[PDB]
Amino acid sequence: LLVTPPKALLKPLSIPNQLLLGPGPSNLPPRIMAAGGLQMIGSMSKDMYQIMDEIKEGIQYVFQTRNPLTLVISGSGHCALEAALVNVLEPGDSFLVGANGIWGQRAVDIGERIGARVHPMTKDPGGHYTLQEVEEGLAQHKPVLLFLTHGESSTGVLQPLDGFGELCHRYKCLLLVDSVASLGGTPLYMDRQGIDILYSGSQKALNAPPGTSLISFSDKAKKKMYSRKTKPFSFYLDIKWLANFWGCDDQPRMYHHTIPVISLYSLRESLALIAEQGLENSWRQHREAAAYLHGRLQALGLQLFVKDPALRLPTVTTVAVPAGYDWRDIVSYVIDHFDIEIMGGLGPSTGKVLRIGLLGCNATRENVDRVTEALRAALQHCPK
Amino acid sequence: LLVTPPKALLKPLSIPNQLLLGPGPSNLPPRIMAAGGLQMIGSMSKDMYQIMDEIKEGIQYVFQTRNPLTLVISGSGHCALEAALVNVLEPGDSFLVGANGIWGQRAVDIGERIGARVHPMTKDPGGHYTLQEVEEGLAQHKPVLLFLTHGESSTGVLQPLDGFGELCHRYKCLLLVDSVASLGGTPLYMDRQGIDILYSGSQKALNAPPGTSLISFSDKAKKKMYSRKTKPFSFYLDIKWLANFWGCDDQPRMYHHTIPVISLYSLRESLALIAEQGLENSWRQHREAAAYLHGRLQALGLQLFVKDPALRLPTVTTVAVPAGYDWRDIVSYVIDHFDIEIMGGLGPSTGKVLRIGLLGCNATRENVDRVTEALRAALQHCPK
Ligand SMILES: Cc1ncc(COP(=O)(O)O)c(CN)c1O
Ligand SMILES: Cc1ncc(COP(=O)(O)O)c(CN)c1O
């Protein structure tokens, strides 16, 4: 044989203990770790289907919707976003994009690649979107879909949602909202706020492992997707196939792909946990924790990047990089000396911020103390 | 709130004990179950990268290649196939497809959706491809890529590979081979047999959980992908991004998507296991087990669908449905009475066969006895 057994693979796997307090992913509670260690069942068994049904009721609970076209995407954040755009937007269609952070910029890049006409409302890191600025774009471009980042995890901004669905619907437009970094950590009502496509990721405030995502489509969305001239560029993400398998339509579930069974075990449990807590409890926890953290960081003499407290994402706090420090020094000092993961910026916010993450079980005063103690020592030990 | 906590989510998760002896997925050994229950690390940490490096050496070992453009796809089988086709085939390009089973038919459907000219060499269930039939197509259509199903898990056929790479290369063509149902269970040498794109799935003979896949690209493939006029229709599967992150190129690893960390733990271990066994041992085990099973099924008076024993896939055995039975009766009887999953057909083979799966740790005489005992009782108890 050409290749011989890799010598590094012949030692036993060993992973460190890290406290993950960056934008994502998050640490796992015991129940979700327990689910990840279970044995396999038939990917198309009665028992697997029952689990998928329970997961759907769960996504309906956290999204606050009754859309029967609700299901899990076998992929990360990007994969739910991509599934949204490749099933909704045909080549030529007009797409209006709130590019307030990396997430809008990505939604742009996808849009361009599948041949949409892409209308970028660039706002500098920290900025948000006013209903009028939306209708001024809506008037200028007459799009079929508006993408809005709810929890902008690259800028620590909480986008206001109220009204925008009723605005978009007047102009015949569809509302797509990125709630990957917001779901479970701030108020969100899909049906009530008139959202057409809502997606979220497992690895954020739900505390499940990365590589699944949540998506729900309103009836209006469903129509646009179920009366395309062409087929979507993706077969893996084709909604008509996915919808069928997950049991959304009238036809019996036909084999599309193989779903990530053990991940669905974990995701199920993550949804059972926030079910047991209750949504408004979870929003309380994250709102208070966030409040505490900004207090402590303010004491250290650090500055919160988002100045208006009504626009600060509870789940991901941006902190202006203190003048005269190498951000990478701080970030490295923290993990090295305290085994805590924090991040720098991302996209427009690259170099400008530090990012701190409070997500689900991880959103405790304990962890805020820890990250504040760690940032203390770093600030007085990193060169100036 | 609109929706209240689902009452089914408020009971504790419980899953049955099934022996999975269908085409896929397979049961997990203890080490892979142990890995799935571990705690999370930073998705972009030094430690996560070291694991990804070890997984790459592993895919190089089982694929038998030194292609430095080798990596995991964050998706199932279809996702590796789709990633192959959307990065290699530009709209208009000529694509020659060995449609001997469902897998070719799917490769067709993808091909059509991304705007390739799709040349379907339909052969009836059980058939394979002769080097001449390939060069007669190669002469007729002058394709940029030929897709060949190695282990045709819908028909139980083992496609001969030897020569075809040297054939395709003469015509400037690229060879793409679907080794999802063959890797680890029959001889396969990527470099030596001159394969340009080879992919496989985790949930088959490697005994890892579904939702990752393995892919490797030769230099020739790399060139075609790294000199496209257009961008691929997919951002999630864009090879230039994936290659970078996984550490294949010269640039430092930039954030694309979040990789399924806990799955990569499991996949790593699945590769460490077949590393410890050794490839030719694993091929021995599956060849013998397969041999035993055909003996036992022959005794029950059942007929093997693939008549030439040199063309029978060791990992997935097709069995002609016995005259005068409802296949679904047998399949249902087996799971109900013996807790064993077997399958019927799929695509062209739908209704025509029963499928039995011997994959990795599951490919033992014990399990062949069990499935043979179970099929015994079914045959004498199902109506005629
Ligand atoms: C707001 C937001 N948008 C998009 C993503 C992308 O998720 P993934 O990298 O898992 O695809 C994330 C996850 N960090 C996110 O928080
Ligand atoms: C030969 C073959 N091709 C394709 C696939 C598709 O794999 P998945 O459903 O995990 O995408 C499989 C898995 N059963 C396979 O065995």
**Neighbouring C-beta atoms of residue A91, cutoff 10 Å:** 11
Q: In CATH, what is the architecture of B29-277?
A: 3-Layer(aba) Sandwich (3.40)
For chain B, how big is the Rg over CA atoms in Å? 21
Contacts of A192 in chain B (CB under 8 A): 2
Nearest ligand, CA of residue A98?
1
Largest interatomic CA distance in chain A: 67
Pick from B372, B370, B183: nearest CA to B296: B372
Three-state SS sequence of chain B = CCCCCCHHHHCCCCCCCCEECCCCCCCCCHHHHHHHCCCCCCCCCHHHHHHHHHHHHHHHHHHCCCCCEEEEECCCHHHHHHHHHHHHCCCCCEEEECCCCHHHHHHHHHHHHCCCEEEECCCCCCCCCCHHHHHHHHHHHCCCEEEEECEECCCCEECCCCCHHHHHHHCCCEEEEECCCCCCCCCCCCCCCCCCEEEEECCCCCCCCCCCEEEEECHHHHHHHCCCCCCCCCCCCCHHHHHHHHCCCCCCCCCCCCCCHHHHHHHHHHHHHHHHHCHHHHHHHHHHHHHHHHHHHHHCCCCECCCCHHHECCCEEEEECCCCCCHHHHHHHHHHHHCEECECCCHHHCCCEEEEECCHHHCCHHHHHHHHHHHHHHHHHCCC
Q: Counting atoms of ligand 1 from 1, which one is nearest the CA of A316?
A: 16
Contacts of A9 in chain B (CB under 8 A): 54, 57-58, 61, 268, 271-272, 275
Pick from A343, A336, A345, A340: nearest CA to A382: A336
Q: Which of residues 294-323 of A touch B (CB under 8 A)?
A: none
- Compare CB distances from A64 to B1, B36, B209 and report the shortest one's residue: B1
End-to-end CA distance of chain A: 55
**Neighbouring C-beta atoms of residue A111, cutoff 10 Å:** 23
For residue A256, the CA-to-ligand 2 centroid distance in Å is 10
Pocket of ligand 2 (CB under 6 A): A 257-258; B 23-24, 76-78, 103, 151, 153, 178, 180-181, 201, 204, 210
Residues 6+ apart with CB under 8 A from B74: A75, A76, A79, A211, B212, B236, B257, B259, B260
- Compare CB distances from A42 to B18, B276, B278 and report the shortest one's residue: B18
**Neighbouring C-beta atoms of residue A284, cutoff 10 Å:** 12
Three-state SS sequence of chain A = CCCCCCHHHHCCCCCCCCEECCCCCCCCCHHHHHHHCCCCCCCCCHHHHHHHHHHHHHHHHHHCCCCCEEEEECCCHHHHHHHHHHHHCCCCCEEEECCCCHHHHHHHHHHHHCCCEEEECCCCCCCCCCHHHHHHHHHHHCCCEEEEECEECCCCEECCCCCHHHHHHHCCCEEEEECCCCCCCCCCCCCCCCCCEEEEECCCCCCCCCCCEEEEECHHHHHHHCCCCCCCCCCCCCHHHHHHHHCCCCCCCCCCCCCCHHHHHHHHHHHHHHHHHCHHHHHHHHHHHHHHHHHHHHHCCCCECCCCHHHECCCEEEEECCCCCCHHHHHHHHHHHHCEECECCCHHHCCCEEEEECCHHHCCHHHHHHHHHHHHHHHHHCCC
Give the burial class of A129: count Cβ atoms within 10 A of its Cβ; 0-12 exposed, 13-18 middle, 19 or more buried: buried
| CATH code of domain B1-28+278-384 | 3.90.1150.10
Pocket of ligand 1 (CB under 6 A): A 23-24, 76-78, 103, 151, 153, 178, 180-181, 201, 204, 210; B 257-258
d(CA A86, CA A90): 7
Q: What are phi and psi of A176, to 5 degrees?
A: -110, 125
Q: What are phi and psi of A246, to 5 degrees?
A: -70, -10
Residues 6+ apart with CB under 8 A from A188: A63, A64, A150, A161, A179, A182, A198
Distances from the Cα of A225 to the Cα of A97, A166, A176, A243, B233, angstroms: 19, 20, 13, 11, 18
Which tokens is A194 given?
A: 């008139």
Under a CB-based contact definition with an 8 Å cutoff, are residues A148 and A98 in contact? yes
Under a CB-based contact definition with an 8 Å cutoff, are residues B101 and B155 in contact? yes
d(CA A181, CA A25): 10
Contacts of B17 in chain A (CB under 8 A): 39
Domain chopping of chain B, boundaries:
1-28+278-384, 29-277
d(CA B371, CA B20): 10
For residue A203, the CA-to-ligand 1 centroid distance in Å is 9
Q: Do A235 and B106 touch (CB under 8 A)?
A: yes
